[PDB]
Design goal:
The structure is a homodimer.
Chain A: H1 9-14, H2 35-41, H3 53-66, E1 72-73, H4 80-84, H5 118-121, H6 123-136, E2 142-147, H7 149-158, H8 166-174, H9 176-199, E3 204-209, H10 217-241, E4 249-253, H11 260-263, E5 270-273, H12 279-286, E6 291-294, H13 305-319, E7 324-325, H14 338-354
Parallel strand pairs in A: 1-2, 2-3, 3-4, 4-5, 5-6, 6-7
Helix pairs in contact in A: 2-3, 3-6, 7-8, 7-9, 8-9, 9-10, 13-14
Pathway (chains A, B): Porphyrin-containing compound metabolism; protoporphyrin-IX biosynthesis; coproporphyrinogen-III from 5-aminolevulinate: step 4/4
GO molecular function, one term (chains A, B): uroporphyrinogen decarboxylase activity
Organism (chains A, B): Homo sapiens
């Protein structure tokens, strides 16, 4: 019972269909690079201006007021899942995302909630999704999301960011059983969470495996890939059994060049790419079935609007007009110019039409 | 006038020749994972126990006393070059490597020394190399090293580590001219420094492009690759003109999967690989001319000695007995077990012989 979708270009491209132009959106489009974002977020702490449906809806809508983006992504945080699982977060302005008491011993898994009860703990996200879907009034599709099991595990074990994931990877090598146990707990929580996002109104889903690069092919296929496959399989099944139509699912593995081939067979309609993988080579790895997403170096936006136009033109030529959704290789950075983001969006639309006409 | 080399396996493998077994060494073999390393380094600050020839020689020799490594690498720091260029470092125990006053404006380049005078500022490194070469008494070859121009630039602009290199990459996009100027200054300083290391006794050289991954193919070919090529070209030329025999040169580009093909044509005998690139695929990218180096996930050493043996066996099978030097995909970590490092070394020797016999 939601408004009928007016612009569905992003969805058609996601399913592999031909479109009049290439649809585009930006990871972190609702982010600190927007002055209005900082003001709204300054209402209260992170997990308060995030637990408010109206606040998330407003943040989600802000970028769409500045740029004709072909999709909106619900504003939230990947860390909401580990939190709903029972872990305490202490979001500070300096460090940012942080778990003061990380998982380090196998025994630490005992403090986690049964993954079956996580969806009920994340009701505020569902409310924000329904509210945003209503307010968007069918302008463009609404993307729902969550972090992949491995990536969520790294935050839970490391306690935050890391340039090596040494503690998390030590778990994989020294505690393989406990690692699989944690990864399964995360999977069993993500499935009902993602299904709930669609029930609440999400029209597409993206699984963020932001810390894929720290693993090599072998560890990835052993600890990340199985669960990435399981998420898509179980979400699709539960949606069908509930009488709902499955939505297109995207798998983004940052620094996951080595896993592109497996990811194209993981049960996702779209495979997101970071900027280090050449578009043509990515096309080779994935095949001709799946849709590819993104890829411009987010830092490319520091260049002039004219230079951004040329970089976008070159990117579109490599990807080709078929099975492609434009985006950056990673999320927008806090110090980027909103005007340069607009130039990126406008360039994709302009050149994608010229590439067709 | 140095001792004649007894075990030259690493050098023969470096030039592409067949060997009785696969030679092996570890990046950071002289590192905090060794108790004896912490004690020696605790003599004074970083740039004091580093400016002492006897101290560096001792640190270089420590790992060789524990393991039958096929090469030794002089103990030093990649940051010695920017320092010799005129930048002040404030090495603290918490943060580690740091420039309190980083380069941020083009005008900041004016405080740097003429690259022609850098080698004279790095005499202590040359003294340590000669001393180590003498004390090694020809047991195994001595590797000299330096950081690549782009990687050195990131430290100079960022002021230290970074997960995005946003400031350094902003220089590439907004200040392309100043970026090329800085990269050229770094190249003109590295050449005489590396040549001096060989004159002092280095038998091989490795250029560390540790921050290659932050750049995509386009930026890499524009700002990193040209200078990487220039270093090898000019070092070889200066060595020949001085009557010395050029030494085998290694190019290590961490997270540089996208540049393996160009790197194999950059004028280096060896191309070092991080653990995310599958050996067979790396072989495809580089060709059949160059020698490949390393690759085991340093974190693999957290696994049991028996498991490490199996992981090593699998790695050697993928690489094959020809044109290969075993090593890790990156430097050893501070919390790793010296006994596990020994197991890595022993496994390479054992399995490489079985792979031949």
């Amino acid at each position: 019972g939601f408004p009928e979708l007016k612009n569905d270009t992003f969805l058609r491209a996601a399913w592999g269909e031909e479109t009049d132009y290439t649809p585009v959106w930006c990871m972190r489009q609702a982010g600190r690079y927007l002055p209005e974002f900082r003001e709204t977020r300054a209402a209260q702490d992170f997990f308060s201006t995030c637990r408010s449906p109206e606040a998330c809806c407003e943040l989600t809508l802000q970028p769409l007021r500045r740029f004709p983006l072909d999709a909106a992504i619900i504003f939230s945080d990947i860390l909401v899942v580990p939190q709903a699982l029972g872990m305490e977060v202490t979001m500070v302005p300096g460090k940012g995302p942080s778990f003061p008491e990380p998982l380090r011993e196998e025994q630490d898994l005992e403090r986690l909630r049964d993954p079956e009860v996580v969806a009920s703990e994340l009701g505020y996200v569902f409310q924000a999704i329904t509210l945003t879907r209503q307010r968007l009034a069918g302008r463009v599709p609404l993307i729902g999301f969550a972090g992949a099991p491995w990536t969520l595990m790294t935050y839970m074990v490391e306690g935050g960011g890391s340039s090596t994931m040494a503690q998390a990877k030590r778990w994989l090598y020294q505690r393989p059983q406990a690692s699989h146990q944690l990864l399964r707990i995360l999977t069993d929580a993500l499935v009902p969470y993602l299904v709930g996002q669609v029930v609440a109104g999400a029209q597409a889903l993206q699984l963020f495996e932001s810390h894929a690069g720290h693993l090599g092919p072998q560890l990835f296929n052993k600890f990340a890939l199985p669960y990435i496959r399981d998420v898509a399989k179980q979400v699709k099944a539960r949606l069908r059994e509930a009488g709902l139509a499955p939505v297109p699912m995207i798998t983004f593995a940052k620094d996951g060049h080595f896993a592109l081939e497996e990811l194209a067979q993981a049960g996702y309609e779209v495979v997101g790419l970071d900027w280090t993988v050449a578009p043509k080579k990515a096309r080779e790895c994935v095949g001709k079935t799946v849709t590819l997403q993104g890829n411009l170096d987010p830092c490319a936006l520091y260049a002039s609007e004219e230079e951004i136009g040329q970089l976008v033109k070159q990117m579109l030529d490599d990807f080709g007009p078929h099975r492609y959704i434009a985006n950056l290789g990673h999320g927008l950075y806090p110090d980027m110019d909103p005007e340069h983001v607009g130039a990126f969006v406008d360039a994709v639309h302009k050149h994608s039409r010229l590439l067709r006409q």
